Amino acid sequence: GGADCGLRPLFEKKSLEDKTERELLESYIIVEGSDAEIGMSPWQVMLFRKSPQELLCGASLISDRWVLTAAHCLLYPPWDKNFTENDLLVRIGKHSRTRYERNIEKISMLEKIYIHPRYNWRENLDRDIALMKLKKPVAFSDYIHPVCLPDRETAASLLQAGYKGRVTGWGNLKEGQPSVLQVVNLPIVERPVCKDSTRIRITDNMFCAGYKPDEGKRGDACEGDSGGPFVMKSPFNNRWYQMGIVSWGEGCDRDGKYGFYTHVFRLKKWIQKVIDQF
């Protein structure tokens, strides 16, 4: 599925708007977040561990058989993490964090994991992206629906400083755990400001988002949220597009610090290549 991407069954399809999407549209020219509405992010996936039944990361549904996530969720040698297909399972259609949502959520097994060949875990998590092929296709519903991958023009017009995006996840609320899916809308920040906030070498395959100390507002992703989607609603065709993947950050919601995200469009050719061969 991908022709009906980005149009949510409970919102766009019914001409209903969620509580905070107007905030995103008005800007076009999880710590400190809030509870998500039912069906607000039908592409949100939970990367789950089979051994100690645990939440590992967020992820996103891009088609009936493909899930997108951060490569650090699967491979991060500094912490002795190197997961294979059989160590994990994905839970799609969820709202509650801990509860097995009977008749609503669907669980899938991984058939193959693809990590970007030039993923730089040794230094700055450059090219922090990974694809996962589901063993069997998932059926869409009111709570399960894929998000769109951006094209050159969508990336060009939407990826601008000041424009707000949305991050969702079941991660930590502070640097305990939420009962349900959290959501926070954050503005994209100027590259110079991103660079000047850290000693880490940032590349073109990343972008940072968040409020500046003087802006008053707060918000950020945190542990448990990584691998999750950073999405924006296009004001041209009303579809939701995934512009970033929650990558890294120095702490959570720290003043003067910003969350970093994998630049999905710049790595799109790798995505297409993988899906077109496997």
Binding site: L56, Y100, I107, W248, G249
Partner: peptide, 13 residues
């Protein structure tokens, strides 16, 4: 950064 659950019944794994 960097990277309570109810068990899952045998309806997948």
């Amino acid at each position: 950064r960097x990277l309570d659950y109810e068990p899952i019944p045998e309806e997948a794994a």
